[PDB]
């Protein structure tokens, strides 16, 4: 049974440090990259960094330098996230995620509560009101190329409340296994789109685009899909 | 026992960056997204005509979400690593300096 299990909720005093774990079962962590993702309440996904557990190579988004330290222990099949000198700005749900061509497997998330020349990913619209059965198009514009080996490393995710994100599309246009045919992707170079046709009641969620060709593996600002009122 | 696997019908994903060896070869780590696994991985190094060779004798996938290391010797200069069959076959542009 393939699963990523994270450690329980943390109550940290301001200025203190914390270390979160991500234990894998059914698969080996050394197989692919392991990333950590930050999500503040009602806000978008923030890619912290990634580890290659096989050699211990780490890469971070500049925003998390001097804050986050990602490690891995291959013997216990576990990846870790160390966060130093915590403030209210660090209060969020931290997710661990497996993969390169989109994050197919995600941990359940760990709540961390604190109490006493850069790449730009433009996701439009921020909110989209649509009637049941309508066609919905979500755009993602990257400031830099998302290409690697002549392929666009553009991925799309669906995120419902109180749940980790779900991979829909990988490599700009490829449908993830188990995802219904109503979801489709298109685009090249810097401009990309996600299409949901027809929109069902289960499609009410927040959608995110993401690049992974080169570090940082930046997510778009997100699109909240709602039903027309 | 008579080892016989059908050619994989589904899609493949690249798992890690293509790694170059010291003996002029490359290691492509892939995972299978389709059905019918265990199956034989369709693999060819071609132009935009076969240009490169396979080192890993019989590349096979055991199950889904289980990466497989494929060692191959690409030619010097431009080449295209073709993994799997259509629809959505993986085509990786490679340049060996």
- Looking at the structure, do residues A78 and A175 belong to the same domain, yes or no? no
Domain carrying residue A128? 119-220
Which residue is closest to A150 within chain B, CA to CA? B93
Structure determined via: X-ray
Do A191 and A141 form a contact (C-beta atoms < 8 A)? Answer: yes
Residue A213 tokens read as: 């060709």
Interface test with A, best of B34, B65, B81, B90 (most A CBs within 10 A): B65
Which residue is closest to A103 within chain B, CA to CA? B15
Domain closes at, from A101, A118, A135: A118
Cα gap A96→A104, rounded to integer Å: 11
Report the 10 Å Cβ neighbour count for A177: 16
Report the 10 Å Cβ neighbour count for B20: 14
Residue A57 lies in a domain: yes
Domain closes at, from A60, A91, A118: A118
- Looking at the structure, do residues A113 and A128 belong to the same domain, yes or no? no
Q: Which helix (H) or strand (E) holds A49?
A: strand A46-52
Beta bridge partners of A142: A121
CA distance to partner chain B, nearest, from residue A111 (Å): 27
CA torsion, points A75, A80, A85, A88, in degrees to nearest 10?
-150
CATH code of the domain containing B4: 2.60.40.350
The residue whose two tokens read 């211990």 is A56
Interface test with A, best of B27, B31, B84 (most A CBs within 10 A): B31
Domain carrying residue B73? 1-97
- Looking at the structure, do residues A10 and A90 belong to the same domain, yes or no? yes
Q: Which helix (H) or strand (E) holds A175?
A: strand A174-175
* Structural domains counted in chain B: 1
Residue A226 lies in a domain: no
Report the 10 Å Cβ neighbour count for A180: 11
B 21-50: CB under 8 A from A: 29, 31, 33-34
């Amino acid at each position: 049974v393939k699963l990523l299990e994270q450690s329980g909720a943390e109550l940290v005093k301001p200025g203190a440090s914390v270390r979160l774990s991500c234990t894998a079962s059914g698969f080996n962590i050394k197989d692919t990259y392991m990333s950590w993702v930050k999500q503040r309440p009602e806000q978008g996904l923030e890619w912290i960094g990634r580890i290659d557990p096989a050699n211990g190579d780490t890469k971070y988004d500049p925003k998390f330098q001097g804050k986050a330290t990602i490690t891995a222990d291959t013997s216990s099949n576990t990846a870790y996230l160390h966060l130093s000198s915590l403030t209210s700005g660090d209060t969020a749900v931290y997710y661990c995620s497996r993969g390169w061509e989109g994050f197919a497997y995600w941990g359940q998330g760990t709540l961390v509560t604190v109490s006493a020349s850069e790449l730009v990913m433009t996701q439009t619209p921020a909110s989209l009101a649509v009637s049941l059965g309508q066609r919905a198009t979500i755009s993602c514009r990257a400031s830099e190329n998302v290409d690697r080996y002549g392929n666009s490393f553009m991925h799309w995710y669906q995120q419902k409340a109180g749940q980790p994100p779900k991979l829909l599309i990988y490599r700009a246009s490829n449908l993830e296994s188990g995802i219904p045919a109503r979801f489709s992707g298109s685009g090249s170079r810097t401009d990309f789109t996600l299409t949901i046709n027809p929109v069902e009641a289960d499609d009410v969620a927040t959608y995110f685009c993401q690049r992974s060709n080169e570090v940082p593996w930046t997510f778009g600002g997100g699109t909240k899909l709602e039903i027309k009122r | 026992m008579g080892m016989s696997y059908s050619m994989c019908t589904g899609k493949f994903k690249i798992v890690k960056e293509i790694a170059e060896t010291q003996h002029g070869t490359i290691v492509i780590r892939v995972q299978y997204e389709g059905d019918g696994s265990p199956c034989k991985i369709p693999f060819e190094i071609m132009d935009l005509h076969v240009l490169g060779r396979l080192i890993t004798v019989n590349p096979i996938v055991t199950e889904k979400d289980s990466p497989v290391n494929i060692e191959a010797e690409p030619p010097f200069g431009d080449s295209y690593i073709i993994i799997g069959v259509e629809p959505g076959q993986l085509k990786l542009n490679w340049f060996k300096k």
